[PDB]
RNA sequence: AGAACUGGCGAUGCGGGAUGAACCGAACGUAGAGUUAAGGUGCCGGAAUACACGCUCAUCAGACACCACAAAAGGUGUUAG
RNA sequence: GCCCUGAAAAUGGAUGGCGCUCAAGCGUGUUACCUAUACUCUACCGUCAGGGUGCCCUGACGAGUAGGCAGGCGUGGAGGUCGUGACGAAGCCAGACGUAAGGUCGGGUCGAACGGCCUCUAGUGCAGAUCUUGGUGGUAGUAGCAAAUA
RNA sequence: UCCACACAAUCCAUAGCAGGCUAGGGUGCAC
């Protein structure tokens, strides 16, 4: 339904709270870890420093765990997992697993189209074979 | 001049620090400004105290050891150029470009027949006048510093001489071309003028 | 600013529905009590609920 | 006496269009609320419109970047005006209050 | 060509050579590959024979450090130059190897120029030679790989394949 | 001095509380003093003060002094809660108008517009600032707090 | 429902209310600036003449004008000026509709239509002036100073305008 | 150096102050719009080359606090009282 | 008051700088502006008030090292449950989010294995410790390859 | 070899808006 995924993009901080003094040393991992010591400017938690992770950055409970398309994705192991998904249709998108083989995707793709749950399953299908 | 592409400014009897404030701001506006008549600008106060300040700056310009700067600028165009660098943020690239946009020329540079213009009450006459601890022209400061000056006033004298001739014949021909109103005229039309604006 | 306000927030609440329920029966029974308390008058049923939620320190042998 | 000089002064940004083929440069549309008098626009044009880039609020990039426009030409002639921007403005700041 | 790096070209069109694990200075050869890129086989051969003789310098655009200077710049004026004879000798070998592949394919004496040359330091061999005061420092050697493809294609293709902007609006 | 602020129920800056007429308050107010601008706001400015800044009582959260909420709601043991009646009754400072002035609890004022509400923090009304008692100026000040 | 977390399910069409307050612009805004509304005319230039309906402000000045042309056609503006002064037709727009589409009779109807307002205009132009009138048309902005005169008056003129705006559209797909 | 009474720093961001742990304003989830504090409005540098007046002409001097110096003596027919 | 006189210091001039002097000084009043994360407001995340039906809503408070507590993420393996696989794990670019721990898929590589859930356990998460070991860049085409002159 | 120059990537009719044809001094030109 709602235009609320426009807030999810708008809100952010997709500042991207990375490690930092990351870029200088390769080793420094891209993933965040808290700045323990005083002397860090970041720990003082000003702007321009990179903002820290907290809960308060968190988006609206309704928007969370959704694609930018606004459909909820549920990862779909097989033909069976589709059966719950066809009930959703409009509500849910199905993202078809990395584990999945080509031949299995075919059955799954073909059945999905009849279900009316096109999102990312046709994209994933094109990719594997065509 | 007060537009977007002119920009030519009259230095005669203008205040150095004041000319530089507006000049910097217009270069920050993005104009390319030609400051003309550099020797004729005046900076107020007695010469002796003014020369004492510059003298220390010369004394500074005696060192470092090294070569390659610092500098003290002898001449009226040069003094004025130094003044802009201080006026504008010298740290930044924007500031730097604005500085590249100045040219200061002494006397007149190669003919700008188009008039150089006074800025909104920039001139030292009114801006002295209670008064005048003395007042010092840039040409007076620089005779004591040394000579890019000596050639510049020499040219000023020749430029002013040549132009002063031109202006007399120009004005003669203009009042002549002009006597339009020495009234003619009335012709219903003048009533139209008085109305036309009027309403 | 602050204070009384900060102190109240600084506290806590209050009960708490008991940690773990090994008994399934105890998990629904307590929930049944808050249920009865709220639709009608009964103060006791609301009181019993808290006590069942606390561990060895609230629950009384009689 | 004057001319303009004076600060009043509110306006709107209508929208800033950062546009080429690579041919065209950048346009900015401004609509000042009532202001310039028809006369005040016309004898003049070149009135420089300076908006401060401040914190509004929460953390906006609160910088020592004071922004200056100029009116290129009117388009609107009694109201709306064309402007262009030259500098760097803060981030997608169409909307924002115009002002000295 | 070989088990390779970046060929990006055509088998009918190109000739291949590569040198495997030669012991020569990695910097000196790099210079030489840089300098004698786009040129023929005959021009390059003379250019290298000249190098050994001290007729032609090889430019050292990169790689510095008390390298002799402009005895003559030859190609351009640049301070740094040597005329590394060993390193030149292996490339003479490499060009002769390619030139023989080219000849065998039946590509013409007239054929074209050197598209692609690289130089990688392959492994660095280990070795060591002892030092004073009961301490050890190591002297090692660099095996190098150099890749050559010479291509049918340079004059012709540069015109034919004419080849990159375009449009506009469906 | 902070603990007496907490006593008046000035929890933050741009907080407000009404106080009554007596020497005892004043004397307690004296410890508070360099916290405060104070004075009598007139009959009208107080009307303008309640409408924007007023809030709801306990047994409910904050719910404002807005139109519906006062007429139907607000507890009121002593007398009539309704908007005009309540405001009259506090200003007259008669019986249990001290219980009326057990407001819900602080008025949370806007910062002054134009800073006409801020003459110097440094100064007293006698220094030429904001500080201290001033009837006239408090009504001007509250208008700005809108 | 039930159990078990929790997706949807859809809705709407609600509100609500206003009404005295519906209205307040709806004549009006005209009141501040003067004038009628659209359709607006070339008095000037040329003497005898002409009609257009003001589809757009891109902003005021920069204004969009239209009529018909599916095939070969007839022209069209975005212009910052050239020629136009108002008439006496008013809609409940100011001046928003648009593209440059029309078509069925549009040019011609608008041409017959003009005659009347223009024929009403030229005596009032003789009564004031003509040569002078160009300079007014040239502006475009506009508006306050003098919104007058009569013309006589509307019903058909509204009909073309209402249609033009509706006409201005198209849907139906196409490749050219 | 060593106590008392208190706030801050430590563990407190952000705005002001050239920079600058504890000076002023200010106690900070996010994001925006508005308006303000402290403090500032010739240029750098928002924003006044503001308005009424008076002294000063040394470049005094652009300074709450501050590694901001300047005294006894103070002349003095400098100005003023 | 002002001011000079008292008034001398070491690599180069400044009141932050340019440096104006009926001021851009300093003091007396005064008008208008500018300006924070403040304050107000809009939207919304936690806590606590609480309400109401695994879920929805009202309003207040809400930086944080040492540090306490509580919820969650990820790891190898076990069992059971849900399955997945001859193009799986794994890899690198990217693509989607979750503040976030992580998450999901795609390119195009790869040629056999892998998730989820519940419950559990533990050789269970690193930038660092003149940390261990291996590999690698700059240092460099640099020092040395020079005293019987053969 | 390179100098100078085309092309494109960087006071009147009045259509129907607009123009711009043709009946009857101000300033751009290789000076």
UniProtKB/Swiss-Prot annotation, chain A:
GO BP annotation list: cytoplasmic translation
Subcellular location: Cytoplasm
Keyword set includes Membrane: no
One Pfam assignment: Ribosomal_L32e
SUPFAM superfamilies reported for this sequence: Ribosomal protein L32e (SSF52042)
Protein keywords: Cytoplasm, Phosphoprotein, Ribonucleoprotein, Ribosomal protein
A GO molecular-function annotation: structural constituent of ribosome
GO cellular component: cytoplasm; cytosol; cytosolic large ribosomal subunit
Modified residues (Phosphoserine): 40
Top-level lineage group: Eukaryota
Keyword Phosphoprotein attributed: yes
Xref: InterPro entries: Ribosomal_eL32, Ribosomal_eL32_CS, Ribosomal_eL32_sf
Family of the protein in this entry: Belongs to the eukaryotic ribosomal protein eL32 family.
UniProt subunit comment: Component of the large ribosomal subunit (LSU). Mature yeast ribosomes consist of a small (40S) and a large (60S) subunit. The 40S small subunit contains 1 molecule of ribosomal RNA (18S rRNA) and 33 different proteins (encoded by 57 genes). The large 60S subunit contains 3 rRNA molecules (25S, 5.8S and 5S rRNA) and 46 different proteins (encoded by 81 genes).
Function, in words: Component of the ribosome, a large ribonucleoprotein complex responsible for the synthesis of proteins in the cell. The small ribosomal subunit (SSU) binds messenger RNAs (mRNAs) and translates the encoded message by selecting cognate aminoacyl-transfer RNA (tRNA) molecules. The large subunit (LSU) contains the ribosomal catalytic site termed the peptidyl transferase center (PTC), which catalyzes the formation of peptide bonds, thereby polymerizing the amino acids delivered by tRNAs into a polypeptide chain.
UniProtKB/Swiss-Prot annotation, chain B:
Keywords on record: Acetylation, Cytoplasm, Isopeptide bond, Ribonucleoprotein, Ribosomal protein, Ubl conjugation
Family matches, as Pfam families: Ribosomal_L13
Statement: the UniProt record of this protein carries the keyword Ribosomal protein: yes
Post-translational modification: N-terminally acetylated by acetyltransferase NatA.
GO biological process, one term: cytoplasmic translation
GO terms assigned for molecular function: mRNA binding; RNA binding; structural constituent of ribosome
Example of a GO cellular component annotation carried by this entry: ribosome
Compartment(s): Cytoplasm
Record-listed N-acetylserine modification sites: 2
Chain residue numbers at which the record places covalent cross-link Glycyl lysine isopeptide (Lys-Gly) (interchain with G-Cter in ubiquitin): 177
Claim: Acetylation is one of the keywords in the record: yes
Predominant subcellular localization, coarse grouping: cytoplasm
Residues annotated as transmembrane: none
Family stated for the protein in its record: Belongs to the universal ribosomal protein uL13 family.
Function in brief: Component of the ribosome, a large ribonucleoprotein complex responsible for the synthesis of proteins in the cell. The small ribosomal subunit (SSU) binds messenger RNAs (mRNAs) and translates the encoded message by selecting cognate aminoacyl-transfer RNA (tRNA) molecules. The large subunit (LSU) contains the ribosomal catalytic site termed the peptidyl transferase center (PTC), which catalyzes the formation of peptide bonds, thereby polymerizing the amino acids delivered by tRNAs into a polypeptide chain.
Note: Present with 43300 molecules/cell in log phase SD medium. There are 2 genes for uL13 in yeast.
PANTHER family per UniProt: LARGE RIBOSOMAL SUBUNIT PROTEIN UL13, RIBOSOMAL PROTEIN L13
Name of the featured protein: Large ribosomal subunit protein uL13A
From Swiss-Prot, chain C:
Residues modified as N6,N6,N6-trimethyllysine: 50
Localization terms from the record: Cytoplasm
Function: Component of the ribosome, a large ribonucleoprotein complex responsible for the synthesis of proteins in the cell. The small ribosomal subunit (SSU) binds messenger RNAs (mRNAs) and translates the encoded message by selecting cognate aminoacyl-transfer RNA (tRNA) molecules. The large subunit (LSU) contains the ribosomal catalytic site termed the peptidyl transferase center (PTC), which catalyzes the formation of peptide bonds, thereby polymerizing the amino acids delivered by tRNAs into a polypeptide chain.
Note from the entry: Present with 63700 molecules/cell in log phase SD medium.
Family classification: Belongs to the eukaryotic ribosomal protein eL18 family.
Known partners and oligomeric status: Component of the large ribosomal subunit (LSU). Mature yeast ribosomes consist of a small (40S) and a large (60S) subunit. The 40S small subunit contains 1 molecule of ribosomal RNA (18S rRNA) and 33 different proteins (encoded by 57 genes). The large 60S subunit contains 3 rRNA molecules (25S, 5.8S and 5S rRNA) and 46 different proteins (encoded by 81 genes). eL18 interacts with NAP1.
The name this protein goes by in its record: Large ribosomal subunit protein eL18B
Species this chain originates from: Saccharomyces cerevisiae (strain ATCC 204508 / S288c)
Parent sequence residues shown: 1 to 62 of 186
Curated annotation (Swiss-Prot), chain F:
Gene Ontology terms: cellular component: cytoplasm; cytosol; cytosolic large ribosomal subunit
Location in or out of the cell: Cytoplasm
Leader sequence residues: none
UniProt key word Ribosomal protein: yes
GO biological process, one term: cytoplasmic translation
GO MF annotation, one: RNA binding
Keywords, comma-separated and alphabetical: Cytoplasm, Ribonucleoprotein, Ribosomal protein
Family per similarity comment: Belongs to the universal ribosomal protein uL30 family.
Assembly and interaction partners: Component of the large ribosomal subunit (LSU). Mature yeast ribosomes consist of a small (40S) and a large (60S) subunit. The 40S small subunit contains 1 molecule of ribosomal RNA (18S rRNA) and 33 different proteins (encoded by 57 genes). The large 60S subunit contains 3 rRNA molecules (25S, 5.8S and 5S rRNA) and 46 different proteins (encoded by 81 genes).
Comment field (misc): Present with 101000 molecules/cell in log phase SD medium. There are 2 genes for uL30 in yeast.
Main function: Component of the ribosome, a large ribonucleoprotein complex responsible for the synthesis of proteins in the cell. The small ribosomal subunit (SSU) binds messenger RNAs (mRNAs) and translates the encoded message by selecting cognate aminoacyl-transfer RNA (tRNA) molecules. The large subunit (LSU) contains the ribosomal catalytic site termed the peptidyl transferase center (PTC), which catalyzes the formation of peptide bonds, thereby polymerizing the amino acids delivered by tRNAs into a polypeptide chain.
Protein's recorded name: Large ribosomal subunit protein uL30A
Gene giving rise to this polypeptide: RPL7A
Full protein segment contained here: 99 to 244 of 244
């Amino acid at each position: 339904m709602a235009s609320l995924p426009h807030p999810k993009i708008v809100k952010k901080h997709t500042k991207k709270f990375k490690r930092h003094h990351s870029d200088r040393y390769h080793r420094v991992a891209e993933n965040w870890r808290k700045q323990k010591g005083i002397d860090s400017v970041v720990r003082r938690r000003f702007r321009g420093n990179i903002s820290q992770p907290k809960i308060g950055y968190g988006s609206n409970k309704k928007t969370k765990f959704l694609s930018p398309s606004g459909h909820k994705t549920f990862l779909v192991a097989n033909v069976k997992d589709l059966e719950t998904l066809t009930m959703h249709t409009k509500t849910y998108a199905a993202e078809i697993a990395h584990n999945i083989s080509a031949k299995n995707r075919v059955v799954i793709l073909a059945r999905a189209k009849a279900l009316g749950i096109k999102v990312t399953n046709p994209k994933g299908r094109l990719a594997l074979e065509a | 001049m007060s537009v977007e592409p002119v920009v030519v400014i009259d230095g005669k009897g203008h205040l150095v620090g004041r000319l530089a404030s507006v000049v910097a701001k217009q270069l920050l506006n993005g104009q390319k400004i030609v400051v003309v008549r550099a020797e004729e600008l005046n900076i107020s106060g007695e010469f002796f105290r003014n020369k004492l300040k510059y003298h220390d700056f010369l004394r500074k310009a005696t060192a470092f050891n090294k070569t390659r700067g610092p500098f003290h600028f002898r001449a009226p165009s040069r003094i004025f150029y130094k003044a802009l660098r201080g006026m504008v943020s010298h740290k930044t690239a924007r500031g730097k470009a604005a500085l590249e946009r100045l040219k200061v020329f002494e006397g007149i540079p190669p003919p700008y027949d188009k008039k150089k213009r006074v800025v909104v009450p920039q001139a030292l006459r009114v801006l002295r006048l209670k008064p005048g601890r003395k007042y010092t022209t840039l040409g007076k400061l620089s005779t004591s510093v040394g000579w890019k000056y000596e050639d510049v006033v020499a040219k000023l004298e020749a430029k002013r001489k040549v132009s002063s001739a031109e202006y007399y014949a120009k004005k003669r021909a203009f009042t002549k071309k002009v006597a339009s109103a020495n009234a003619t005229a009335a012709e219903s039309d003048v009533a139209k003028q008085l109305a036309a604006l009027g309403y | 600013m602050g204070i009384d306000h900060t102190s109240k927030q600084h506290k806590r609440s209050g009960h708490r529905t008991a940690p773990k329920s090994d008994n399934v029966y105890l998990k629904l029974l307590v929930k049944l009590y808050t249920f009865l308390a709220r639709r009608t008058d009964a103060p006791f049923n609301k009181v019993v609920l808290k006590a069942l939620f606390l561990s060895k320190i609230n629950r009384p042998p009689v | 006496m004057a001319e303009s000089h004076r600060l009043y002064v509110k306006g709107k940004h209508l929208s800033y269009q950062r546009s080429k083929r690579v041919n065209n440069p950048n346009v900015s549309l401004i609509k000042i609320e009532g202001v310039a008098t028809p006369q005040d626009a016309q004898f003049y044009l070149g009135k420089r419109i300076a908006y401060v880039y401040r914190a509004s609020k929460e953390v906006r990039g609160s910088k020592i970047r004071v922004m200056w426009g100029k009116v290129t030409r009117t388009h609107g002639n009694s109201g709306v005006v064309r402007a262009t921007f030259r500098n760097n403005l803060p981030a997608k700041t169409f909307g924002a209050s115009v002002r000295i | 060509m070989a088990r390779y790096g970046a060929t990006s070209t055509n088998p009918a069109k190109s000739a291949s050579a590569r040198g495997s694990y030669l012991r020569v200075s990695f910097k000196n050869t790099r210079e030489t590959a840089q300098a004698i890129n786009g040129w023929e086989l005959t021009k390059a051969q003379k250019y290298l024979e000249q190098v050994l003789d001290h007729q032609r310098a090889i430019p050292f655009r990169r790689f510095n450090s008390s390298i002799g200077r402009t005895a003559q710049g030859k190609e351009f004026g640049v301070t740094k130059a040597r005329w590394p004879a060993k390193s030149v000798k292996f490339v003479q070998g490499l060009l002769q190897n390619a030139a023989a592949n080219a000849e065998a394919k039946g590509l013409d004496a007239t054929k074209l120029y050197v598209s692609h040359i690289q130089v990688n330091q392959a492994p660095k061999q280990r070795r060591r030679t002892y030092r004073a005061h009961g301490r050890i420092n190591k002297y090692e050697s660099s095996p190098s790989h150099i890749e050559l493809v010479v291509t049918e294609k340079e004059e012709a293709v540069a015109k034919a394949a004419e080849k990159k902007v375009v449009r506009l609006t469906s | 001095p902070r603990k007496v602020l907490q006593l008046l129920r000035l929890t933050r800056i741009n907080s407000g509380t009404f106080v009554k007429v007596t020497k005892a308050t004043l004397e307690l107010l004296k410890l508070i003093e360099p916290y405060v601008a104070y004075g009598y706001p007139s009959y009208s400015t107080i009307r303008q003060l309640v409408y924007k800044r007023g809030f709801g009582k306990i047994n409910k959260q904050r719910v404002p002094l807005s139109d519906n909420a006062i007429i139907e709601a607000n507890l009121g043991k002593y007398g009539i809660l309704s908007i005009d009646d309540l405001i009259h009754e506090i200003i007259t400072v008669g019986p249990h108008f001290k219980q009326a002035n057990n407001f819900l609890w602080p008025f949370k004022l806007s910062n002054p517009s134009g800073g006409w509400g801020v003459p110097r923090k440094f100064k007293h009304f006698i220094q030429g600032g904001s500080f201290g008692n001033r009837e006239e100026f408090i009504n001007k000040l509250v208008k700005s707090m809108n | 429902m039930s159990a078990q977390k929790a997706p949807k399910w859809y809705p709407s069409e609600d509100v609500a209310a206003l009404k005295k307050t519906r209205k307040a612009a709806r004549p009006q805004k005209l009141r501040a600036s003067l004038v009628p509304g659209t359709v607006l005319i070339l008095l000037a230039g040329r003497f005898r003449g002409k009609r257009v309906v003001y589809l757009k402000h891109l902003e005021d000045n920069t204004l969009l004008i239209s009529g018909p042309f599916k095939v070969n056609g007839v022209p069209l503006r975005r212009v910052n000026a050239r020629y136009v002064i108002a008439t006496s037709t008013k809609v409940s727009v100011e001046g928003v509709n648009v593209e440059k589409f029309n078509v069925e009779y549009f040019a011609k109807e608008k041409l017959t239509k003009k005659e009347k307002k223009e024929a009403n205009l030229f005596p009032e132009q003789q009564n004031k002036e003509i040569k002078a009138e160009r300079v007014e048309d040239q502006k475009v902005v506009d508006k306050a100073l003098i919104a007058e005169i009569k013309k006589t008056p509307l019903l058909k003129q509204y009909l073309s305008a209402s249609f033009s705006l509706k006409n201005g559209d198209k849907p139906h797909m196409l490749k050219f």
